[PDB]
């Protein structure tokens, strides 16, 4: 073979006797995990044949990558063995590791500095949502009725000292699976509304759920009013 | 299938990863006594619950080894 | 063959096919002995002697110090005419109310106070990427500027172009209603 062939000190100790031909040295292995009980891995340009006595474990925690996302990374390095796949669990973000010690410590190191990297990188996408109001003005009106100075609240200044501080996200209007709970776990305090008068408009930020999701508030909180005459 | 007559269990345990895919390692206490009886590999995983009532040991299969203790 | 090493080495601000064209340029590169790659990942993976293992460690290490000094972010200006509405905020003197309009440049000013954030999707090279859709939203500096009735816009490359996607949608033609 053109790649070369690296084993250990008790990989090169036994002996053998039967026919092996090495027309094929890849799979020549798989019958050599049949017949003389060793461990091996062909990481793209070398064979590391180890013991099989020497396998160790290991429990690797996952931060920033899903069980799913991290194994077709994999696939597209190349350095993936299907004889040995890892082990997942689809509601913990770790995954459990079996083989030579090599490809062992190898995988260890890689969700180490697959999570340090997407530290750096940012989820949040904020989207800017424009509503066109229909039934009311915007903006804090107020009647100068010279009995008392009433003062009447609008859109952009009720719903905005509701959500004052409040840590939280927010909920259901009454009258990929970490990839999702990290977007719905955005701080309601983080929505800031401006309103906008000469296009009677209002202007709100969110995470890509809750713009969307203020504004089933706000249709259902601006109904046509009614005309009351007097005698 | 195969009889095992008074050989060793780190032979009788390495015969196991002679014939099936996913390789068999165990332990020091594991690989020290032996077994006489009609044990075949038909079914690796249906064998080792018959030898936890004739050896008295323990086995783990997570998906890709056996890890069979004391 | 026997003192053959290995070695797992992370990657900052270099991408996998950023370091691979790097070794075919110096001419130390080993085309017998490639290195492994991960596409999502900012790492790689070394075997051979242990001269060219421990070389390439300490290559990784002295590129990542290079371009931690360099920035990556250009900033770009924009300048949008406006056409359906003024620029900067008009008050009208009514004798009743002291009312007051905000214009463009201090709504949207006011809405993306602080906020260490990217922003998204208006609704009415993949870590070189993902470092330059990681700019912080709290970035943008918007100045009117009314003797041309046009703004000044700042940000990098994309936001520019994202805000004027809003300021678009967002002065529609105003429209007449007459009394009696």
Same mark, same amino acid.
């Given at each position: 073979?053109?790649?070369?062939?690296?084993?250990?000190?008790?990989?090169?100790?036994?002996?053998?006797?039967?026919?092996?031909?090495?027309?094929?040295?890849?799979?020549?292995?798989?019958?050599?995990?049949?017949?003389?009980?060793?461990?091996?891995?062909?990481?793209?340009?070398?064979?590391?044949?180890?013991?099989?006595?020497?396998?160790?474990?290991?429990?690797?925690?996952?931060?920033?990558?899903?069980?799913?996302?991290?194994?077709?990374?994999?696939?597209?390095?190349?350095?993936?063995?299907?004889?040995?796949?890892?082990?997942?669990?689809?509601?913990?973000?770790?995954?459990? !590791?079996?083989?030579?010690?090599?490809?062992?410590?190898?995988?260890?190191?890689?969700?180490?500095?697959?999570?340090?990297?997407?530290?750096?990188?940012?989820?949040?996408?904020?989207?800017?949502?424009?509503?066109?109001?229909?039934?009311?003005?915007?903006?804090?009106?107020?009647?100068?009725?010279?009995?008392?100075?009433?003062?009447?609240?609008?859109?952009?200044?009720?719903?905005?000292?509701?959500?004052?501080?409040?840590?939280?996200?927010?909920?259901?209007?009454?009258?990929?699976?970490?990839?999702?709970?990290?977007?719905?776990?955005?701080?309601?305090?983080?929505?800031?509304?401006?309103?906008?008068?000469?296009?009677?408009?209002?202007?709100?930020?969110?995470?890509?759920?809750?713009?969307?999701?203020?504004?089933?508030?706000?249709?259902?909180?601006? !109904?046509?009013?009614?005309? !009351?005459?007097?005698? | 299938?195969?009889?095992? $007559?008074?050989?060793?269990?780190?032979?009788?345990?390495?015969?196991?990863?002679?014939?099936?895919?996913?390789?068999?390692?165990?332990?020091?206490?594991?690989?020290? $006594?032996?077994?006489?009886?009609?044990?075949?590999?038909?079914?690796?995983?249906?064998?080792?619950? $018959?030898?936890?009532?004739?050896?008295?040991?323990?086995?783990?299969?997570?998906?890709?080894?056996?890890?069979?203790?004391?």
């Amino acid at each position: 073979l053109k790649e070369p062939v690296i084993v250990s000190k008790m990989a090169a100790r036994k002996k053998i006797t039967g026919n092996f031909e090495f027309h094929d040295p890849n799979a020549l292995l798989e019958k050599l995990s049949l017949q003389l009980g060793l461990i091996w891995y062909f990481d793209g340009q070398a064979i590391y044949i180890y013991d099989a006595s020497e396998m160790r474990n290991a429990v690797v925690s996952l931060r920033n990558v899903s069980l799913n996302e991290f194994n077709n990374f994999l696939k597209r390095s190349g350095l993936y063995n299907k004889n040995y796949p890892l082990r997942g669990d689809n509601r913990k973000g770790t995954f459990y !590791v079996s083989g030579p010690p090599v490809y062992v410590d190898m995988v260890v190191n890689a969700a180490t500095m697959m999570d340090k990297q997407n530290d750096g990188i940012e989820l949040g996408r904020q989207k800017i949502g424009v509503m066109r109001l229909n039934n009311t003005f915007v903006g804090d009106r107020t009647y100068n009725l010279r009995d008392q100075k009433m003062v009447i609240p609008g859109i952009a200044t009720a719903i905005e000292r509701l959500l004052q501080g409040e840590e939280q996200p927010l909920g259901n209007i009454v009258s990929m699976s970490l990839q999702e709970a990290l977007k719905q776990n955005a701080a309601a305090g983080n929505i800031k509304i401006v309103a906008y008068p000469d296009t009677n408009s209002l202007l709100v930020k969110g995470t890509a759920e809750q713009v969307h999701f203020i504004e089933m508030l706000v249709k259902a909180l601006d !109904v046509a009013k009614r005309h !009351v005459e007097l005698s | 299938g195969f009889v095992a $007559k008074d050989d060793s269990l780190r032979t009788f345990f390495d015969a196991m990863a002679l014939q099936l895919k996913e390789p068999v390692i165990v332990s020091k206490m594991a690989a020290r $006594k032996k077994i006489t009886g009609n044990f075949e590999f038909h079914d690796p995983n249906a064998l080792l619950e $018959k030898l936890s009532l004739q050896l008295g040991l323990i086995w783990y299969f997570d998906g890709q080894a056996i890890y069979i203790y004391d």
